[PDB]
Design a protein around this nucleic acid. Structure first.
Ligand SMILES: *[C][C]([O])[C]O[C][C][C][N]C(=O)C1=[C]C(C2=C3[C]=[C]C(=O)[C]C3=OC3=C2[C]=[C]C(=O)[C]3)=C(C([O])=O)[C]=[C]1
Ligand SMILES: *[C][C]([O])[C]O[C][C][C][N]C(=O)C1=[C]C(C2=C3[C]=[C]C(=O)[C]C3=OC3=C2[C]=[C]C(=O)[C]3)=C(C([O])=O)[C]=[C]1
Lengths: 26, 454, 428
RNA sequence: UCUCUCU
RNA sequence: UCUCUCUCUCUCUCUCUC
RNA sequence: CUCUCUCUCUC
């Protein structure tokens, strides 16, 4: 599935990501 | 600034001229295919017309078709499904058109010039629709890439004909897939990277490595791509190195351009309404697309047992290229909750040949957003010297360690560990109102899922 | 010398005639816009009047506006926010004026001559104000340059209309950014550098490279910029050496001219006082700007919850182009500590339309300095040789040996006052 | 002139 | 007749290993 | 470079 984000709009949000899964494969 | 206003005005006119051609061409084709107002505003009909244009200008494929014609299909005619409503029911009839006839019609609509910018714009619109609708994990696995990096798959369906304009909008993951396929062909074929053609492949490999490098933001990522480019005979080492680069892009996101490329039916309706894009100008990242969609009514074919709102949200997502954007931000701008792909009770917009075109009904698409925002080409996330002004005996200070400092893989891993899924990006930038055409007062949102393909 | 006394006196009169034209024109426009003594001395009003003249003489943009008119704005009329105080409160009303009427008023104030020097002088004043107020890392990042070289962006907002005079005051970073845009355009467009227009672009590329070469001091930097000029089809390689040249300027700084361009309100007040700049003469690098500012009183519109001292410091720095200068030397000259940009509780001087012009009050700007110094066009003191030079360079070498700061009463700059010296970076 | 969310 | 301190809040690009 | 330039723009 999706584990990250790619912003398209300029808004003050926080760009989420699945940190434990991204660093697991390192 | 004050000098880039002119340049900004120049760009607006040039894009407005492209939008005018698309609308003028669509109007001409609608009157030539004999389509009524309802059928002219059908998204399926616009898709067929757009695809006919793209195939008519496909010089390479057309040449191959001429040399090796397909079975029962002459390589000089194109077409697609045109849907007409007679007696209240919908029917599909396959239209065949001469590619020379379509090319002449397109050129006449753009004042006799080729205007490949309009074609690339339509190709981007198709790519955005494909990204929001279909998920290509099979290509990710087949190239050896982890199927989880679907957030970087922006513009993976863009044909190679879209250079520069197409390359700017495509993402890190798609770029890496292009590099990997080049690597795989070299490993499988020893003649690759050698001979007259190997020289051509090498220059192509260099160019797309540079544009991939410019997509990154951290210095560590750019240096890693620069090393891979230098490899004269790339192999598994670059294969793994690029795979690491793609995984790093999930945290240290690259710069992917986002543009709102609308269907040609919207432009055709606007141009027929007397609207002059060339005069007042246009912008694919500003308020212009949002304002156009507010006043534009578009119909679509809805298959039996399908929620019209979910299809409209899918078209809304494709229009603004927000397939991989946060659901919370998309929900805020639209004003109605955006659902993940798994909870969308709809199939693709394009209708298949084998589909019973008798239980199909049409509905109006709700392509209206409560707010409007500026599309970004940026990802996520002082003075070091002096310039004397007065004649004084002071010493001119500078930050020696930092200036001389700028003269691999462990560094990249360290960078992403520091990053956390809470950092505020685009600080102070919000979402405006449709009545606020000058982007004066931003509206910063306060924020359950956030992954469309989750 | 002894022969350049006549030359210096001649130059002083020519600059004084330019300032007299600026002052005379402001007086007429104030009398013709019907502005009271207080409103005429408002810095916001002076900027609006200045911006009206600059746009009235923009032949290229005016032509484009005629050919391709904007929406709701006729291309023959200009104007801006004029702030009028009646009954204690401030209100803003947009004034619309014919660009030809503005041109006639300006020309008549200069005895019927175009006087392009006055327009460029106002353009330099606006650039100095923009440099001290706003930091353009977006353009640096967009063009591919590291945003850390914000000290070399002097005069980055100056329009191309300010030639010679404008190029002298602009910095290495702005010159490099201009070249980098040319390279980026050439790389993207294959027809660039080719055809009749390519020849015109080539001469522009050569000329702007020549002024950049003259801006440098070390022989190594000049040779490398000479190499970049010789490239018939510059590309990524010429991209890199220009970036390297920009980075070397942080240590081996170039020669950037610094001139004190005051707001037109100060000149209008002085001319109304009877001062004859043509007779007494003027100079943008001497004591004249300092002595004018000491006796000049100017007001500004203060947004709520804003320190007037910080806004006055911002205007003082923009007046003398001390945006990128050492804070210690700037503090020593002014007499009151100059705070870095991050610690300034103020926004830009110009007020936006979306701002409620009802909670705004006015304050007097303290544009007076305890000391005065002479503005400098100089810095301080292949590629491996360039890196070797900046390695020997230390952030302790004394520059301008024996050259100090004088008193306002010492009009001949006879006895220098050498300072003895905690931050020093405005944008840091 | 094809089709597909999610190995 | 615009606006802004501090990473792109707008600066396209005139299509492909044809 | 402690003052010795500037009459404008790929108009
Ligand atoms: C390698 C080699 O072979 C390459 O070559 C190239 C050149 C040739 N071509 C010619 O001549 C021509 C073409 C054409 C076309 C076109 C053009 C342009 C554009 O852009 C597009 C196009 O498309 C097309 C074509 C053809 C065919 C098809 O199909 C498509 C022409 C026309 O069009 O007419 C002519 C010529
Ligand atoms: C380049 C080409 O394309 C074109 O050319 C043209 C030339 C002839 N004409 C002219 O130039 C003229 C101009 C004018 C003006 C002026 C002048 C001078 C100065 O310095 C400035 C100016 O400004 C202006 C103008 C105009 C308009 C506007 O708007 C501004 C003139 C008058 O003014 O009159 C004339 C001519």
């Amino acid at each position: 599935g999706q584990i990250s984000i790619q912003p398209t709009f300029s808004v003050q949000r926080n760009l989420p990501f699945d940190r434990p899964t991204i660093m697991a494969a390192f | 600034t004050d000098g880039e206003r002119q340049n900004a005005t120049e760009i607006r006119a040039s894009v407005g001229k492209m939008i005018d051609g698309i609308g003028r061409f669509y109007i001409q084709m609608c009157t030539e295919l004999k389509l009524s107002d309802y059928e002219g505003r059908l998204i399926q009909n616009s898709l067929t017309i757009e695809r006919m244009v793209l195939s008519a200008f496909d010089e390479r494929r057309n040449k191959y078709l001429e040399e090796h014609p397909s079975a029962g299909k002459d390589p000089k005619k194109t077409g697609g499904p045109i849907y007409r409503r007679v007696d209240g029911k919908w029917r599909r009839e396959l239209i065949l058109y001469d590619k020379e006839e379509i090319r002449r019609i397109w050129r006449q609509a753009n004042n006799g010039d080729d205007a490949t910018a309009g074609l690339t714009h339509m190709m981007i619109w198709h790519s955005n629709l494909n990204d929001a609708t279909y998920q290509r994990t099979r290509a990710l696995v087949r190239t050896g890439m982890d199927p989880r990096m679907c957030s970087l798959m922006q513009g993976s369906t863009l044909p190679r004909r879209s250079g520069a304009a197409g390359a700017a909008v495509k993402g890190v993951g798609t770029m890496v897939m292009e590099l990997i396929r080049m690597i795989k062909r070299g490993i499988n074929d020893r003649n690759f990277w050698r001979g007259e053609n190997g020289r051509r492949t090498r220059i192509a490999y260099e160019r797309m490595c540079n544009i991939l490098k410019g997509k990154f933001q951290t210095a560590a990522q750019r240096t890693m791509v620069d090393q891979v480019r230098e490899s004269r005979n790339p192999g598994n080492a670059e294969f793994e190195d690029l795979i690491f680069l793609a995984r790093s892009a999930l945290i240290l996101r690259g710069s992917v351009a986002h543009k709102s490329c609308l269907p040609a039916c919207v432009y055709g309706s606007a141009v027929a309404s007397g609207y002059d894009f060339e005069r007042e100008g246009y912008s694919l990242v500003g308020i212009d697309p949002f304002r156009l969609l507010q006043n534009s009514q578009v119909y679509s074919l809805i298959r039996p047992n399908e929620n019209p709102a979910h299809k409209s949200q899918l078209v809304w997502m494709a229009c603004h290229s927000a397939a991989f954007e946060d659901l919370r931000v998309s929900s805020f701008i639209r004003g109605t909750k955006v659902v993940p792909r798994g909870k969308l009770s709809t199939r693709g917009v394009q209708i298949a040949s084998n589909e019973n075109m008798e239980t199909m009904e049409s509905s109006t698409l709700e392509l209206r957003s409560r707010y409007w925002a500026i599309r970004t080409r940026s990802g996520g996330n002082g003075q070091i010297s002096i310039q004397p002004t007065f004649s004084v005996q002071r010493n001119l200070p500078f930050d020696r360690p930092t200036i001389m400092a700028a003269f691999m893989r462990t560094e990249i891993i360290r960078l992403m560990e520091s990053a956390r899924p809470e950092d505020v990006s685009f600080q102070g930038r919000g979402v405006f109102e449709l009545s606020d055409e000058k982007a004066t007062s931003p509206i910063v949102p306060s924020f359950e899922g956030s992954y469309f393909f989750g």
